[PDB]
Structure 1
Amino acid sequence: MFFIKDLSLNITLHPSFFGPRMKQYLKTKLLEEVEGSCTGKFGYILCVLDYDNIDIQRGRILPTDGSAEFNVKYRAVVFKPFKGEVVDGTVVSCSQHGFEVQVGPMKVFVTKHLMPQDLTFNAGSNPPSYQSSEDVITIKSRIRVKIEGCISQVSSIHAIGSIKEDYLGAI
């Protein structure tokens, strides 16, 4: 599931930082504008590998202010869920409408009606939970869900998944 996609970002550097340790401030800002990003087209940008060999190429000077623009080519580790994918994470919150599991940087939620019937919701519980014949799901409980659909937004991606198929539940 996780990926290592080849990306490239364009940064406009102000003449100010046209010093000797520029390559440095260039890189440094790349990392401030990438690691932690989130697109619907790349999902979660998590980390730039091979720091030492980032390519800056020659930047060209814009023409009204000194600012030079470099097309920084790099490579890094990303992860964007998919519909019909199967991953397992740890549940975090849980209410009368379901629990929300946390696969990585992301958060997948499961409807009270996307699980099995012989699994109810226990209100008078501490912490809040869902009981079964032999199973009991709450906070720390490790689940394994099937991501039904994804909805990208802002700088995060949410998705709803089910546990009504087979081999889906606790572990």
Structure 2
Amino acid sequence: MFFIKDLSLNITLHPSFFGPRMKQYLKTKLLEEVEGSCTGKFGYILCVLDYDNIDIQRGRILPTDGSAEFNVKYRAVVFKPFKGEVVDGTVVSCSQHGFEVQVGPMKVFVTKHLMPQDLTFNAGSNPPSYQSSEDVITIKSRIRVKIEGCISQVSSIHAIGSIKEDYLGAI
């Protein structure tokens, strides 16, 4: 799921960068190292918006290693899975236990053991994909999955979905 969110950050500006234009490297470090990052707590930070009015209030020198550290608060957008709401995405990869579906930036995994039993993997697809009587679910096939699991080890998310019910499976 997508949101826009108000987040904060702590970045340590190593002492070399302390010239007049430090603020530049701060934002530079920000986008370059906050965009496109998974976090267990918030999700994939996608777009740092409001690139103007980001709060950069004041830095503290850490006693040893003498590097400044700043607490920057900002606004951005995040793809955040959950459990129990339908999500759409085309498959990309596949396996014998299922097929990974790439949704947003998260390659969801839907495992047949959660999908409706009528489509047991007919392994005969090349490229591998599942062939069911109602529809044949291919690699770039559109699929509507409800998410029936998630995991957030920090700086990572893997979720779990199923299409066992109606309005589900292929699209």
TM norm. shorter chain > 0.5: yes
2: CA distance between counterparts of 1:65 and 1:146?
A: 48
* Identical positions, percent: 100
TM-score by length of 1: 0.90
Contact in 1 for aligned 2:41/2:154 (Cα 8 Å)? no
1:33-66 deviations in Å (ceiling 9; x for gaps)? 2112222111111121011222211223334454
1: CA distance between counterparts of 2:95 and 2:67?
A: 52
2: CA distance between counterparts of 1:39 and 1:65?
A: 27
Alpha carbons of structure 1 residues 15 and 130: separation in structure 2 relative to 1, 3 Å: closer
Helix, strand or coil: the match of 1:42?
coil
Q: CA deviation at 1:125?
A: 2.2
Instruction: Give unpaired runs (5+ residues) of structure 1.
Output: none
Q: CA deviation at 1:157?
A: 1.1
TM-score by length of 2: 0.90
| Range 139-148 or range 54-63, more displaced | 54-63
| Range 52-61 or range 16-25, more displaced | 52-61
What number of residue pairs does the alignment pair up? Answer: 171
Contact in 2 for aligned 1:96/1:123 (Cα 8 Å)? yes
Q: CA deviation at 1:78?
A: 1.0
| Range 143-152 or range 127-136, more displaced | 127-136
Contact in 2 for aligned 1:87/1:145 (Cα 8 Å)? yes
| Range 31-40 or range 132-141, more displaced | 31-40
RMSD of the alignment, in Å? Answer: 1.7
Contact in 1 for aligned 2:92/2:140 (Cα 8 Å)? yes
Alpha carbons of structure 1 residues 103 and 63: separation in structure 2 relative to 1, 3 Å: same
Helix, strand or coil: the match of 1:53?
coil
Q: CA deviation at 1:28?
A: 0.7
Q: CA deviation at 1:138?
A: 1.5
| Range 42-51 or range 59-68, more displaced | 59-68
Alpha carbons of structure 1 residues 66 and 100: separation in structure 2 relative to 1, 3 Å: closer
